[PDB]
């Protein structure tokens, strides 16, 4: 029962960028020395929407077979117990639950992991008393928080600007990616000298906000 074991990403979820070459982890732990030729590995993908599972890759001890183009599990690594699945240029529709099934007759073990595919926002700041437009494009998922903040010499602590700022609707693109633009109207007459402003973009694909500097002049 516990002479053969499988371990997936801690946390149960892996996140990867669109078009990157992701590696879904699957580690084997056997009570005996691994003899890859007498071992079998199978990877399945299950849609989180349709709840239907498909075989994605199979390792028959002395030869592999990929059902998902480019899919591979390197043999020279499987000996170290690494049954991880490499998927070249992953796509948005490939997000889902992946399952790694290991067979070392008569023992069998498995594990599942969630793969999320994300696209980082491309934020562009452009100038039209002063209309500013911040366009962040090509991001996935849809949810995205755009904000504006300013730091005056008086109060250098960044404070959020929630006036004269209109954040437009998020439009879906053809390649499944998303778009959104936000506009801020600044009046020189009302602003302090040398204030530093910035468009702040928060999104799941970012570990820290994507900022864009600018000062009136």
């Amino acid at each position, epitope marked *: 029962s516990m002479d053969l074991k499988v371990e997936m990403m801690a946390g149960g979820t892996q996140i990867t960028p669109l078009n990157d070459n992701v590696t879904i982890f699957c580690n084997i732990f056997y009570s005996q020395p691994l003899n890859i030729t007498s071992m079998g590995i199978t990877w399945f993908w299950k849609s989180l929407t349709f709840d239907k599972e498909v075989k994605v890759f199979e390792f028959f001890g002395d030869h592999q077979e990929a059902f998902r*183009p*480019g899919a591979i599990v390197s043999p020279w690594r499987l000996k170290s117990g690494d049954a991880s699945l490499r998927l070249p*240029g992953i796509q948005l*529709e490939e997000a889902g639950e992946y399952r790694c099934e290991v067979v070392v007759t008569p023992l069998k073990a498995q594990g599942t992991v969630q793969l999320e595919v994300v696209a980082s926002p491309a934020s562009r700041l452009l100038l039209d008393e002063d209309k500013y437009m911040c366009e962040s494009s090509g991001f996935y998922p849809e949810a995205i928080n755009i904000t504006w903040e300013k730091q005056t010499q008086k109060f250098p602590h960044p404070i959020e600007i929630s006036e004269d700022v209109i954040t437009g609707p998020t439009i879906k693109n053809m390649d499944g990616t998303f778009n959104v633009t936000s506009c801020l109207k600044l009046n020189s007459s009302q602003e302090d000298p040398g204030t530093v402003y910035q468009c702040v973009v928060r999104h799941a694909s970012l570990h820290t906000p994507l900022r864009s500097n600018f000062t009136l002049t």
Partner: antibody, heavy 121, light 108 residues
């Protein structure tokens, strides 16, 4: 948005060769399998094979090995299929098709308009 | 182990409004069956995938089902625009194969 452009038709001589082109656009050419399907009134739809532009991996229908060869040009996002030493039996429409991924793995979702090939003297 | 798909009947007639059922029998078991629709002088269109999911744009009157070696495509209520040829396709093992298709015509 995903588009697959194929020339309308080709008139070819018996014994000759021909290269069918398929201009792909609207998506990452190297991340999807490109398939080719033969269609003649007599045998319905027949699979020729597929190629993963990205690492060039191919899968062929045994009946076409030695007859068809799939290649790809990444720089131009174009799939190609070559038929060697043609005979009238090769006269048919040859479709270009993109296989999806995920819920659409192994499903030919997008098709080119097809190139009608006529083998004749 | 080439899997052969046998579609029956080869030709079907349906009056507008009638229920239509076409089958696809596979020589050996298959994980999933896919269907495509094709009208004269144009390329086939994905109609059904993963055995029962409709491709975007396909009318809800269509229904696909099946298991193992036996599958079917149904039309609750026939319509003129449904007259076409339907093919099943599988790829659980090489080579990918298509059924000979079922030509569905209008009945009169």
């Amino acid at each position: 948005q995903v588009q697959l452009q194929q020339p309308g038709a080709e008139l070819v001589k018996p014994g000759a060769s021909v290269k069918m082109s398929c201009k792909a656009s609207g998506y990452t050419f190297t991340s999807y399998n490109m398939h080719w399907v033969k269609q003649t009134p007599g045998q319905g739809l027949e699979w020729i094979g597929a190629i993963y532009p990205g690492n060039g991996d191919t899968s062929y229908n045994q009946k076409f090995k030695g007859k068809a060869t799939l290649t790809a040009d990444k720089s131009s996002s174009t799939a190609y299929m070559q038929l060697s030493s043609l005979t009238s039996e090769d006269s048919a429409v040859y479709y270009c098709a993109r296989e999806g991924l995920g819920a659409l793995l192994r499903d030919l979702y997008y098709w080119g308009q097809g190139t009608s090939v006529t083998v004749s003297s | 182990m080439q899997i052969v798909l046998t579609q029956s009947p080869a030709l079907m007639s349906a009056s507008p409004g009638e229920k239509v059922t076409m089958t696809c029998s596979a020589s050996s078991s298959v994980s999933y069956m896919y269907w495509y629709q094709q009208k004269p002088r144009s390329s086939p269109k994905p109609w059904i995938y993963l055995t029962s999911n409709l491709a975007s744009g396909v009318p809800a009157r269509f229904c696909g089902s099946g298991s193992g070696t036996s599958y079917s495509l149904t039309i609750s209520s026939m319509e003129a625009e449904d007259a076409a040829t339907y093919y099943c396709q599988q790829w659980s093992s090489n080579p990918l194969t298509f059924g000979a298709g079922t030509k569905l015509e209008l009945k009169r």
